Design a protein around this ligand. Sequence first.
Ligand SMILES: O=P(O)(O)OC[C@@H](O)[C@@H](O)[C@H](O)CO
Ligand SMILES: O=P(O)(O)OC[C@@H](O)[C@@H](O)[C@H](O)CO
Ligand SMILES: O=P(O)(O)OC[C@@H](O)[C@@H](O)[C@H](O)CO
Ligand SMILES: O=P(O)(O)OC[C@@H](O)[C@@H](O)[C@H](O)CO
Lengths: 263, 262, 263, 262
Amino acid sequence: EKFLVIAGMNAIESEELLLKVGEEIKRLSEKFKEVEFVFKSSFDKANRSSIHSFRGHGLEYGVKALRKVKEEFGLKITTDIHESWQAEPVAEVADIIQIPAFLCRQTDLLLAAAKTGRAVNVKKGQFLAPWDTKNVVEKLKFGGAKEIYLTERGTTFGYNNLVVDFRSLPIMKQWAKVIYDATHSVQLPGGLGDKSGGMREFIFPLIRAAVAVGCDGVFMETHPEPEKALSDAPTALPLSQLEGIIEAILEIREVASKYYETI
Amino acid sequence: KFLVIAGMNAIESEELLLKVGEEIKRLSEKFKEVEFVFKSSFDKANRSSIHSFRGHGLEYGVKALRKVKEEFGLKITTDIHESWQAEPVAEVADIIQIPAFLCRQTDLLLAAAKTGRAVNVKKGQFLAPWDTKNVVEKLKFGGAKEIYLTERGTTFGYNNLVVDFRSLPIMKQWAKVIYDATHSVQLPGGLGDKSGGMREFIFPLIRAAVAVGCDGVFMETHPEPEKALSDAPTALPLSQLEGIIEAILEIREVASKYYETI
Amino acid sequence: EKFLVIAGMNAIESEELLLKVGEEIKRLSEKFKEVEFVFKSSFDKANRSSIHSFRGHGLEYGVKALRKVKEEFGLKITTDIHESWQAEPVAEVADIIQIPAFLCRQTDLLLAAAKTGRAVNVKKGQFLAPWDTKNVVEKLKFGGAKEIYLTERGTTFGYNNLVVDFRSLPIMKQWAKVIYDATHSVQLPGGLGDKSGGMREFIFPLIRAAVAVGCDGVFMETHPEPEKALSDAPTALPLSQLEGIIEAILEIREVASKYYETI
Amino acid sequence: KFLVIAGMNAIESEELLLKVGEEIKRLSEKFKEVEFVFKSSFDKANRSSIHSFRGHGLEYGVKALRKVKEEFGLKITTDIHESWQAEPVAEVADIIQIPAFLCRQTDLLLAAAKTGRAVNVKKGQFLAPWDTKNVVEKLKFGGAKEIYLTERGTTFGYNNLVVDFRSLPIMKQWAKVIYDATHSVQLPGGLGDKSGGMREFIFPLIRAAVAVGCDGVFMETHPEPEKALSDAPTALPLSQLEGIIEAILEIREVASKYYETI
Ligand SMILES: O=P(O)(O)OC[C@@H](O)[C@@H](O)[C@H](O)CO
Ligand SMILES: O=P(O)(O)OC[C@@H](O)[C@@H](O)[C@H](O)CO
Ligand SMILES: O=P(O)(O)OC[C@@H](O)[C@@H](O)[C@H](O)CO
Ligand SMILES: O=P(O)(O)OC[C@@H](O)[C@@H](O)[C@H](O)CO
């Protein structure tokens, strides 16, 4: 099946920066034709640790910025919602509606996304066991979702740290397509006090493990200059490095794929 | 004075809420040394299964809570799940409760703060004790004056929660601390389509909470927990509430002498 | 039943310092007559993180130092063993033989302690679940142990951190007397790089929880001047504070005891 | 070259050890690109239950290992539990293995180092990746020259282990890293009187190990795991060893291009 690569910018800092990333993703989509690319960005960071951190420029502005990316580059779009009412307006531009990790248990948010007819991708809560995502998928199907994804983004391991339990990939594959969030799986929640920390040095190694184990796609956040990111500065991947990473995981996927177990 | 938040997990019917409110009222008259606050949810917006009990809606719930408040003169507290619910709930709730999974949703916290009511935030199972300082700051920013932080367990491996009592002293630095004796022993998604829990540890850990030092306790009860529509494994039998309260007041009286300063 | 208070110095730095602590413990035993005191110290720290850290002055010297404490103060003695052969020589002076946390699963070490006829106290490994200590007690009984204790000293919670799951007290009480190690439960394993860290500020609060929940005794490490300790410097309790802590837990134990659940 | 440590958890009989050694020898002849080391324990000194299988003693075990080495010319590795065992074991073992629970026992490490043999330390389930730097230093101090650090899971809640693959890159800074594909999926004391495990995850995680980058893999096998006297839930069927080895060599070949420098 066609490997999915969700990539973009964690937050919509400016429509201009968004298009810069979109142009690169567009270029990569032309090269890696065997990959289905979906552009990602959030119109709002509704769960920053601090009240003083960047959130965004509003749903209206965000949707406008995303629609511009879809129109100018012909790229599929994905963004996350935080409250039920946002599902309808977002569904107009988003091909895949993302459900934040902390909200993976909020029945109404899930139902609101499902009735739009759009694909739904749920970030697995850091408090959730792999086998407990089965009920998450059941809620979505109940609400009309036909295309469902579950994203592995790490699990609470002690304080301010996350661990990736790769056993979750084959477990979750039993009821939905699985995506590996290579970015947030290495973040250190609240690690920097008023902001979360992260270890970029482990992004690549862990993504290699992800494709070796076997998944249906990867999620990666990028930025032209991570150091200047308004969110995920510690984990944003330099845009120039995206191509090399994708090539690498496609190669590892190919050689490992014959050994992928059948569910 | 010491705060005791009690009631039942969900509003299964105003008839049941009234039965429980009656007992809480009685206890309230028996323990003048305690400030009781009646709690119940008008909606279980985060059940594991789509087929589990959620409630009768916001309308029915707010009405039931009003009845409890008018029929027993008891303060009220209930949780909200989306920003728009803060205003209508504030009309009856003396304390707006923020769910654990939602402790980081800025707009929810701000909506609660804006109502002018007191706010009690359940500490996320994914949150470190010191990470609550920022939660408090958001509320102060939103104009909140009476802020509570509730300890309800931390993720410990899968389908299990552990109570790290070092959190009480730590959180007390920036807010009043409440100990949720009910959910701290629950086993997240333990029964598959529902969460589990071990009631035998409720009392022991509640004693630890007051020995350590907290500003209040949170307890969910039910006439017949066997028939509870939520928190069935952890709901405390109504008849046992009095004994436990008297117990923690006695322990608190002796232990309070050693509570470290802020 | 008579509450047990195991106290002393983590390591036998010098026979002189040992006697200084013993004198204070002796004084407290005279005051708190309802408490059974047992003097503790290790003739060897066989598991320091670094090869450069203090270990001790040998089994021979240690036993001699301990025997001096027992003779001069008439105090019961307890010390830990690391290899099977040490059980015999140690049993000559130790009333209770302690089994290190990392070694709680070493069958031979446990058996060696049990056949001496002495009481045995096993520190619950940081990797052990409360209910898995049942097999630990079974091994000891099999080996002849008639007086067995299980000590709660924290559980691995993420890296370099330990959490105390007080549910372990009533669970473990089902098969053995339970002791709460107020000292090591707040240590940060490997926290200081070549040495473990710790948070002394939580020692008192956690010990209060221990007696409120209900245990059969407490274990506390002390030192005239913690800052100068050769081991457990971050968690050693000032000797002058020992009396106040004991008085406090006896008071909390009394008021809470009527509520202790029956196993 | 790539290291593959294989054999069976316990020496149930030299007859069985020889059957397994034969297969390992065959594979050794098939994969010249790999260095095979035969492993087996002469004693399970840490079983959960007093009634579980330990072995036939140090004497019987060392003799059985000698037979394997002489009859197949395969290098040997076995674990020690007390300091006195290092010398007699060193006579046959090319690599002395240090158990996970004992990774902090200074005298055990020193005794192993003193024999002059290579030493492989199982990373304690209670140890942080960076905490192994000190383990290595003790061995260097004791004169150890060939030092290995093995990843075998970390405590994650109760009766469960999680493999944090960030440990491979971290540990590689101070030693060669081996991935124990067998015990990393075991469930400590999961069956009550015995430990559990999930064999379905052995292969998937072994693939992750080589995709990330390690100097070797550790695998326990058994003709009929159903009849194994230890590691029954995790022992890999002997017939499946070849397929998995070929698989990790292929993945390693492609992935090695991206292994970060030390
Ligand atoms: O406010 P901080 O803690 O930096 O949070 C960063 C997060 O918002 C980021 O990891 C992500 O968008 C999570 O929700
Ligand atoms: O997993 P289930 O059983 O649906 O449980 C959800 C409950 O524990 C819920 O009431 C709890 O208060 C969640 O916040
Ligand atoms: O070498 P470090 O890591 O400081 O170890 C201190 C320990 O020996 C101490 O916590 C205790 O004696 C544990 O075994
Ligand atoms: O808990 P039980 O089943 O006795 O298991 C012990 C085994 O897993 C043992 O062989 C393992 O290698 C311990 O180190």
